[PDB]
Symmetry: C2
Subunit: 157 residues, 2 copies
């Protein structure tokens, strides 16, 4: 079909760590003030490569992530907030609080991937949007005409 590749030329595997490193204006993190639900945001300083992401297709298969097929995204690291590190869309931006739902549509928790300077994210089932940097306390993710292009590079290889 059309798998999503990493910066080395290799496919994306489910449960494996990748950085959402940006070819645009770095990676993504979990950031919110004071309290709790962390919101998905962009990494601040310059050593901040970001936090590693794990992508999980909805159906068990050959565990390869493909372009356009729906999935779940999560930061598989423990956080200071009790909410799930899996991505939710509020309808606002992306939060961390996501259940999983293998029924019919209406579930602002399923994302997807599609190409352009690499791949992109689509909060879609029948197609809703394509997130971009919010921009202003934290570089949150929303949806725009100028959209956040990122390349997925693997944490230890």
């Amino acid at each position: 079909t059309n798998p999503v590749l990493d910066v080395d030329g290799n496919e994306l595997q489910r449960g494996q760590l990748y950085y959402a490193t940006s070819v645009m204006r770095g990676g993504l993190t979990l950031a919110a003030p004071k309290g709790c639900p962390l919101n998905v945001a962009q990494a601040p300083f310059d050593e901040y490569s970001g936090r590693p992401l794990a992508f999980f297709p909805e159906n068990a298969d050959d565990d390869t992530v493909q372009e356009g097929s729906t999935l779940y995204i999560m930061f598989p690291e423990p956080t200071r907030c009790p909410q799930s590190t899996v991505w939710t869309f509020d309808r606002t931006g992306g939060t961390t609080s996501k259940a999983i739902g293998p029924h019919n549509s209406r579930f602002a928790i399923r994302k997807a991937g599609d190409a352009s300077y690499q791949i992109e994210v689509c909060p879609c089932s029948t197609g809703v949007e394509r997130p971009s940097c919010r921009m202003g306390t934290l570089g949150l993710a929303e949806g725009g005409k100028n959209v956040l292009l990122n390349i997925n590079n693997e944490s230890p290889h």
Copy 2:
């Protein structure tokens, strides 16, 4: 200290996925009725685990030093897939992280003798099989011994 080896004689890493398989039957999963939150349960080999020392150091899981345990997998419940002793007396799913001093029922520990075990540290005791629909996890004197084996290696 002494590192927790996995079943192949190799150390436990952090982030690396491990199945906490029993020794006499099944691994650990997340389980509850049709209502949230989820509790750690026993049974398949279960669900994979992930261990995170509270210090970013050698990146080895070692005997005694505290750590967080998480299921790095998406769940049907909004709560964190990181462990949290409930103290009201099972293992739940509101895993926060705390660098403050003691009184934090989320950090755990490893203890040898099977091979390794678990402990709620910040210790109180060692978790057992709870048997409280599905078999949860409580701390007791009839401990639950598990062994850590790796998922694609």
